[PDB]
Antibody, heavy 215, light 210 residues
Framework: QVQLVQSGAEVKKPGASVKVSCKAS????????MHWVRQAPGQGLEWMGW????????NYAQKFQGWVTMTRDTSISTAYMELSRLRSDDTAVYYC????????????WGQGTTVTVSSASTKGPSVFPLAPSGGTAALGCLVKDYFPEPVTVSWNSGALTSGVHTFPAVLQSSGLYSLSSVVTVPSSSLGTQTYICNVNHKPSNTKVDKRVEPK | QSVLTQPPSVSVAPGQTARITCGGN??????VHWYQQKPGQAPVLVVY???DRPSGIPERFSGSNSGNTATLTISRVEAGDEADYYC???????????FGGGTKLTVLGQPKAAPSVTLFPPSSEELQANKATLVCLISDFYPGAVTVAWKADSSPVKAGVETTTPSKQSNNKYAASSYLSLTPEQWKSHRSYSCQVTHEGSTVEKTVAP
């Protein structure tokens, strides 16, 4: 199927530079113009510019000209966008989109790349089990004080998916994140069933497993 | 010369017809595209070249474009049509792509849901580690506005409170969470702490004790 897959979320210090990638598959990468559009948290879509994947020519909205640089590698059907001298205000989700050979809109969009501009340092999470207090019970896991996003939580190495609610992380005042995962389970299961929340924070190379037992 | 205007919001009863406009100088001679964006997903092209639908977009979505106003029209509105909608043109006289400012579409009439509150106390493991976190989990509420207040022995606490802004769940209701931070002595010094959640004039409280 026609598809655009963007590189993973990145974090950078103010004044640094980031380069984001956009991998296309399922069509002739050199036939359509590639666009980049930004969406800062809570904001509308903002067109940044286009690149001709075939020739390399670029055209920029006035707001983005100069400190945004679009390139491409025909080899791996990958487009690149670079932001220079980053500012805290540049924290946003960045999308590449296919459009124009004769323009019929942007029919294919990548999943978006999050670029966060911050001075905090990579920090692995401390993980804490939230023991349960009847018909159902709520047992959980606390993923505390980590940077950056994201972390992944599964239960019992993936065997447990029903009743799992993993909440969006909070960005504390400290600069660090925290997030909780809770699973609803039958009260007859406690003391009988093992509950383990698998936490993975790739940026700090941290994998942790915690047994969550009744009090 | 190059500004696209949309109403910032439109709201509509279910089953009714919604209409979202896109204003522009001679836009009727330009070629207008529309995008639908639901929360946390990437925009989707729903209408292109004024009025064509890409495959997979149902006919309830139609489009029009004449004079200085283009119109996206959504027939037989469902709650699943709630989203932001952007219009867009390529401006030939500048080779720029321009988006409209976006329209919030609200489908009125979904029913109220009080939040479920779950509250966890610090664990012994956190305490031995100088953390102690109170965790308040708030789920399944509609609509998505809420105030969270922490109490320590009936007295308000504002220090050490971190709260998320509400987010839509998969079931199209909302979630949010609040964390309180305190020292082990602060935790051990009171009879109780409370996570107090108010939603649509009603308050739901959960309380925990050492």
């Amino acid at each position: 199927q026609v598809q655009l897959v963007q590189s993973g979320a990145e974090v950078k210090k103010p004044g640094a530079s980031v380069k984001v990638s956009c991998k296309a598959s399922g069509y002739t990468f050199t036939g359509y113009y590639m666009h980049w559009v930004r969406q800062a948290p809570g904001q509308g879509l903002e067109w940044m510019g286009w690149i001709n994947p075939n020739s390399g020519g670029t055209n920029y909205a006035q707001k983005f000209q100069g400190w945004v640089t679009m390139t491409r590698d025909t080899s791996i059907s990958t487009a690149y966008m670079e932001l220079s001298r980053l500012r805290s205000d540049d924290t946003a989700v960045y999308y590449c989109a296919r459009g124009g050979l004769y323009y019929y809109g942007m029919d294919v969009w990548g999943q978006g790349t999050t670029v966060t501009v911050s001075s905090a340092s990579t920090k692995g999470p401390s993980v804490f089990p939230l023991a349960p207090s009847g018909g159902t019970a709520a047992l959980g896991c606390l993923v505390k004080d980590y940077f950056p996003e994201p972390v992944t939580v599964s239960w019992n190495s993936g065997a447990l998916t029903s009743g799992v609610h993993t909440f969006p992380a909070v960005l504390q005042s400290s600069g660090l994140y925290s997030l909780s995962s809770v699973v609803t389970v039958p009260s007859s299961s406690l003391g009988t069933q093992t509950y383990i929340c698998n936490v993975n924070h790739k940026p700090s190379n941290t994998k942790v497993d915690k047994r969550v037992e009744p009090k | 010369q190059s500004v696209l205007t949309q109403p910032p919001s439109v709201s509509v009863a279910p089953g009714q017809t919604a209409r979202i406009t896109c204003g522009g100088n001679n836009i009727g001679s330009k070629s207008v595209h529309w995008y639908q964006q639901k929360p946390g997903q990437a925009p989707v092209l729903v209408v292109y070249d004024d009025s064509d639908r890409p495959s997979g977009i149902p006919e309830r979505f139609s489009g029009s474009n004449s004079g200085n106003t283009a119109t996206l029209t959504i027939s037989r509105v469902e709650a699943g049509d709630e989203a932001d909608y952007y219009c867009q043109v390529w401006d030939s006289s500048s080779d720029h792509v321009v988006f409209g400012g976006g329209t919030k579409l609200t489908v009125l009439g979904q029913p109220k849901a009080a939040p479920s509150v779950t509250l966890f106390p610090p664990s012994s493991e956190e305490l031995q580690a100088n953390k102690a976190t109170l965790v308040c989990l708030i789920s399944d509420f509609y609509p998505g506005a809420v105030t969270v207040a922490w109490k320590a022995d009936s007295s308000p606490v504002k220090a050490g409170v971190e709260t998320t802004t509400p987010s839509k769940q998969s079931n199209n209701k909302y979630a949010a969470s609040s964390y309180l931070s305190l020292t082990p002595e602060q935790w051990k010094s009171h009879r109780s702490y409370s996570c107090q959640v108010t939603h649509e004039g009603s308050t739901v409280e959960k309380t925990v004790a050492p």
